[PDB]
Ligand binder design. Structure first.
Ligand SMILES: Nc1ncnc2c1ncn2[C@@H]1O[C@H](COP(=O)(O)OP(=O)(O)O)[C@@H](O)[C@H]1O
Ligand SMILES: [Mg+2]
Lengths: 96, 135, 255, 272, 96
C-alpha cells in the first residue's frame, strides 16, 4: 500500500468509464467511446505558490467529481491501478 | 497451325527422336565410353561423358521427332534429380523399351496391356535389385 | 502465436469460423473490441492444439453446436450464388474444415509426365463421383444411350416430314459412343451394338469392352454418372443441329 | 396492338419461335406497355421469366449481423427509414444523432452510404444485436459519379435527401425528416431491394425522365446500357427473361432472338 | 440531477444555433453556418483569485446571453446535453 502526494496545484483523479449505453440506449462499441473527461480526486496537493508567495488552495476537495480536458495531464499506475495527475488549469469544473 | 499425325506414322516419328538423343548419349556409357562435344554459345565447348548434359543439348528440327527427343531427355534428367548418376543407363533402357515395344505395337499388341506388363516386370526387377543390395 | 489463416476478407470470415468452433469471440477491430478489454469469457477453448513449423490443428473445439451449423449453412446458402469455380473451392474448404472432414490424396509417380496424367485421372474420377451423387448413375459403355433409341423410335412414330428425319438422326447418333468404345477395343461397332439392342429384357445388358463379354453393365460395375451422359448428348446435339442450318459462312480470305 | 394475343403474335414471328413470343407476351402483359423487359443470361438449360419488385441494386450488407432471417441470411426491414450519405461514414459522432432520433422511433434503418467503416459500422452491428436498433448498411449503389447520380435516384424514389455538399447537408445535422422510407427492404449477401419507396411521383417522373432525355444523345454501347439500367431500377414493373441454352453459341443466338422480338413489340405498339 | 460547478472564473455556456434563415430570408445550408459564438450561462464559478487573495466576481450573471470567440474553451456533455466551459478571457460581451 502506498500514498500519492501531488505537488504545486496537482490533483490526482481516477477516471470514470461512461455507461455501456447512451441516453438512447445505444450500446456503444469500445472503439467509439473515448477516454472519459471525468473522475474523482483522490489527492489534492499544496496550493499554487503565486507571485507573492501565497499558496491559493485548490478549489477542489479530496473526493469530488471533476471535469477536465481529457487530453492533458500525465498518467500513471500504482499498485495495480492507474490515475491522472492533472493541474488546476486542466480542471474545468466539478459535478454536484 | 497444327498437324495431326496418327498411328505408325506418329510412333515412327517419335521413335526417330528417341533414338536421335539416345545414340548421342550411349556413346559415353561404361569405362571405355568416350566423350561428346557440346558447342557453347561463346567460349570453348563442353567435353563431357555425362548423359543428361549431352541429352539436354539435343534439339531436333522436326517437331514430332523432337517431341520424342524431349520425352527421352526427361528420362535422363528425372534420373539425375533422383540420383545424380546413372543417366546414360536410364536413356539406354528407355530406348530398348521403346523399340522392342513399338515393334510389338506394330504387331497388333494392345499398348495398355503392354504397359501393365512392363510395370509388373519392373516391380519384380526392382525387388530383385533390393534383394542383391549390400549395405 | 500463429498467424491468421487466409487473407483478405476470408481470414476474417475464417477467424469467425475458428471462433464458432472453439466457442471464443473474435476481437474484431471493426466490431468494436479492444484487445486490452478482452476477457476469459470471450476466449476460445479446445481439447488440444498442435502447432508444427508450418501447421496448426485445433482438436476438440468447445464451440457451440448452433454456432458451427449457422457458420456452415451460411457458406451453403451462399455457394448457391457463387460462380467462378475457384471461389466455390475456397468457400468449400471452409465448410470442409468446419465439418471436420477433409481428405487428401497425394498422387505419386516416377516422372512428371506420368504424374501429371495420373493426377488428372483422379480429378476426373472425383468430378464423376460428384455428378453421380447429384443426378444418379446409369449403365456404362454407351449402353444407356443405346437404350434411349427405343424412346426416340417411339417418338418417330409420332413424327412426320423432315422433323421425323431429325429424330432419326439422333437415333443413329446414339450408337456412336457404344460403337467407338468397342471399336477402339478391337471389335465391330455395328456387331456389338446389335447384340446389345438385341436382348431387350434387361436394359442393363451391355458389352464389356475390356473383357470382351456381354454382361449386366450395372452388376459388372460399369456405370456412368447420368449427369455426364445427359450433358454430353445435350451439348453435342446443341452445336450439331446448329451446323445443319448453315447456308453461308463469312471467313477471313486465306493469307 | 390491343391485347396479349396481338403481342404474342408479333413476337412469335420476329423471333420465329412460339415460346419466345409467349414469354414476351406474358411479361409485356404483367408489366404494361409502359413497362420494362430485360434479357439476361440464365444459368440453367431452361429460360425463365421473372418479375421484380422495386428499386434494387447488386450490393448487399457490409456485415452478416444485419440479418433478420437466419436460413435466408437476409435482412427484411418493415417500414424502415433510409439514410442516404454520398461520402464515406466511419466517424461515429456524425451518426449518433440520427441513430438515436431513429432508435427511439423503434423503426428499421437502412443506411445507403458510399461506405460504412470502423466504429461507425461497429456501432451499427453491436446495437443491431443488443436489440437497440434494427439497421443494415449497404455500400454505394454504383461506382464513381454514376453512384452520386444513383444516390439521387434512390433518394427521389424513397423520398429522402442526398447527404452531400450539394444538397447542403451535414451528417450529424440529420433529421427523422431528411431521409426516405419504404414498406420493406430485403438485403441478401450481395443485393438490395428497397420495396415500396415513399418518394414522390414528380421527383422520380423527372429523375427517370431526365435519364431518358440524355440517353437519346448517347451512342456509346456502354453509356447506352448504363442509363437504361438506371431507368430500369427506377420503376416497379420490371420483367426479366433469363435465357438458357446448352452452349454459348446457341445461347448467344437464342438470346438475340428475344431481343429482336422485343424491338418488334416496341415498334408494334408505336406505329401499329 | 447533476449540477456543474465551474472553477477559477470559468462559466458554463449552452450554445445558441443561429436562425434557419438570415436577415434576408436565405435559408443557409448547415455546411455554411458555423458554431455559434453565443449562449446562455448556466453556471458561473468562483471569481479569479487575484494577486492579493481577492476573488474578482465574474461580470456575468447566471443566465445571460454571452458573446465569445467560438474557437476557444473546452466542450463537454452531461446527462444528454453539451455545453462549453469558457474562461473570462473568452467572454467578449453580453447581449441585452
Ligand atoms: N571397369 C568396369 N567394368 C564393368 N563396368 C563398369 C566399369 N566401370 C564402370 N562400369 C559401369 O558402367 C556403367 C555406367 O557408367 P557411366 O558411363 O558412368 O554411365 P552413367 O551416366 O549411366 O552413370 C555402370 O553400370 C558401371 O558399373
Ligand atoms: Mg426478324
Amino acid at each position: 500500500k502506498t500514498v500519492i502526494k501531488p505537488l504545486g496545484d496537482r490533483v490526482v483523479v481516477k477516471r470514470i468509464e461512461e455507461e455501456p449505453k447512451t441516453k438512447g440506449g445505444i450500446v456503444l462499441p469500445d472503439t467509439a467511446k473515448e477516454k472519459p473527461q471525468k473522475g474523482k480526486v483522490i489527492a489534492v496537493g499544496t496550493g499554487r505558490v503565486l507571485e507573492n508567495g501565497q499558496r491559493v488552495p485548490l478549489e477542489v476537495k479530496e473526493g469530488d467529481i471533476v471535469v477536465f480536458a481529457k487530453y492533458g495531464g500525465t498518467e500513471i499506475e500504482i499498485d495495480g491501478e492507474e490515475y491522472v495527475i492533472l493541474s488546476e488549469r486542466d480542471l474545468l469544473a466539478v459535478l454536484q | 497451325a497444327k498437324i495431326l499425325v496418327f498411328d505408325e506414322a506418329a510412333r515412327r516419328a517419335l521413335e526417330r527422336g528417341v533414338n536421335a538423343v539416345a545414340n548421342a548419349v550411349k556413346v559415353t556409357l561404361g569405362p571405355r565410353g568416350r566423350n561428346v562435344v557440346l558447342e557453347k554459345k561463346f567460349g570453348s565447348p563442353t567435353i563431357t561423358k555425362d548423359g543428361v548434359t549431352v541429352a539436354k543439348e539435343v534439339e531436333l528440327e522436326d517437331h514430332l521427332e523432337n517431341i520424342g527427343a524431349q520425352l527421352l531427355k526427361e528420362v535422363a534428367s528425372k534420373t539425375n534429380d533422383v540420383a545424380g548418376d546413372g543417366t546414360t543407363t536410364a536413356t539406354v533402357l528407355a530406348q530398348a523399351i521403346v523399340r522392342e515395344g513399338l515393334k510389338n505395337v506394330a504387331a497388333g499388341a494392345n499398348p495398355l496391356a503392354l504397359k501393365r506388363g512392363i510395370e509388373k516386370a519392373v516391380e519384380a526387377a526392382v525387388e530383385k535389385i533390393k534383394a542383391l543390395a549390400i549395405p | 502465436a500463429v498467424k491468421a489463416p487466409g487473407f483478405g476478407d476470408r481470414r476474417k470470415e475464417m477467424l469467425k469460423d475458428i471462433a464458432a468452433v472453439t466457442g471464443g469471440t473474435v476481437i474484431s477491430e471493426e466490431l468494436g473490441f479492444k484487445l486490452e478489454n478482452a476477457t476469459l469469457s470471450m476466449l476460445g477453448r479446445a481439447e488440444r492444439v498442435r502447432i508444427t513449423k508450418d501447421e496448426t490443428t485445433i482438436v476438440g473445439g468447445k464451440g457451440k453446436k448452433e454456432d458451427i451449423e449457422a457458420r456452415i449453412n451460411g457458406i451453403k446458402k451462399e455457394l448457391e450464388t457463387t460462380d467462378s469455380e475457384y471461389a466455390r473451392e475456397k468457400l468449400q474448404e471452409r465448410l470442409a474444415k468446419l465439418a471436420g472432414g477433409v481428405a487428401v490424396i497425394r498422387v505419386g509417380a516416377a516422372t512428371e509426365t506420368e504424374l501429371k496424367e495420373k493426377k488428372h485421372r483422379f480429378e476426373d474420377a472425383l468430378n464423376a463421383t460428384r455428378a453421380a451423387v447429384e443426378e444418379g448413375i446409369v449403365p456404362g459403355g454407351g449402353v444407356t444411350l443405346l437404350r434411349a433409341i427405343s424412346a426416340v423410335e417411339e417418338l418417330i412414330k409420332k413424327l412426320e416430314g423432315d422433323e421425323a428425319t431429325g429424330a432419326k438422326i439422333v437415333r443413329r447418333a446414339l450408337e456412336e459412343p457404344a460403337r467407338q468404345i468397342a471399336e477402339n477395343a478391337g471389335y465391330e461397332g455395328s456387331v456389338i451394338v446389335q447384340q446389345i439392342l438385341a436382348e431387350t429384357k434387361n436394359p442393363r445388358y451391355g458389352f464389356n469392352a475390356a473383357t470382351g463379354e456381354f454382361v449386366d453393365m450395372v452388376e459388372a460395375g460399369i456405370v456412368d454418372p447420368a449427369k455426364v451422359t445427359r450433358s454430353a448428348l445435350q451439348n453435342a446435339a446443341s452445336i450439331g443441329a446448329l451446323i445443319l442450318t448453315t447456308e453461308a459462312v463469312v471467313a477471313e480470305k486465306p493469307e | 396492338v390491343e391485347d396479349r394475343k396481338a403481342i404474342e403474335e408479333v413476337a412469335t414471328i420476329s423471333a420465329n419461335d412460339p415460346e419466345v413470343g409467349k414469354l414476351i407476351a406474358d411479361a409485356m402483359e404483367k408489366v404494361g406497355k409502359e413497362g420494362i423487359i430485360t434479357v439476361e443470361e440464365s444459368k440453367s438449360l431452361e429460360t425463365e421469366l421473372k418479375f421484380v419488385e422495386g428499386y434494387q441494386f447488386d450490393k448487399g450488407y457490409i456485415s452478416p449481423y444485419f440479418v433478420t432471417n437466419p436460413e435466408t441470411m437476409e435482412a427484411v426491414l418493415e417500414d424502415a427509414f433510409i439514410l442516404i450519405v454520398e461520402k464515406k461514414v466511419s466517424n461515429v459522432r456524425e451518426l449518433l444523432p440520427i441513430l438515436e432520433q431513429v432508435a427511439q422511433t423503434g423503426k428499421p434503418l437502412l443506411i445507403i452510404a458510399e461506405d460504412v467503416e470502423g466504429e461507425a459500422l461497429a456501432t451499427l452491428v453491436v446495437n443491431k444485436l443488443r436489440g437497440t436498433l434494427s439497421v443494415a448498411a449497404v455500400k454505394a449503389p454504383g461506382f464513381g459519379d454514376r453512384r452520386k447520380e444513383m444516390l439521387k435516384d434512390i433518394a427521389a424514389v424513397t423520398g429522402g435527401t442526398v447527404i452531400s455538399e450539394e444538397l447542403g447537408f451535414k451528417l450529424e445535422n440529420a433529421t427523422l425528416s431528411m431521409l426516405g422510407r419504404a414498406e420493406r427492404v430485403r438485403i441478401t449477401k450481395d443485393e438490395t431491394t428497397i420495396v415500396g419507396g415513399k418518394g414522390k411521383k414528380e421527383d422520380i417522373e423527372a429523375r427517370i425522365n431526365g435519364i431518358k432525355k440524355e440517353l437519346e444523345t448517347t451512342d456509346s454501347e456502354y453509356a447506352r446500357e448504363k442509363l437504361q439500367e438506371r431507368l430500369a431500377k427506377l420503376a416497379g414493373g420490371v420483367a426479366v427473361i433469363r435465357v438458357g441454352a446448352a452452349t454459348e453459341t446457341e445461347l448467344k443466338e437464342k438470346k438475340h432472338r428475344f431481343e429482336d422480338a422485343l424491338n418488334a413489340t416496341r415498334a408494334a405498339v408505336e406505329e401499329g
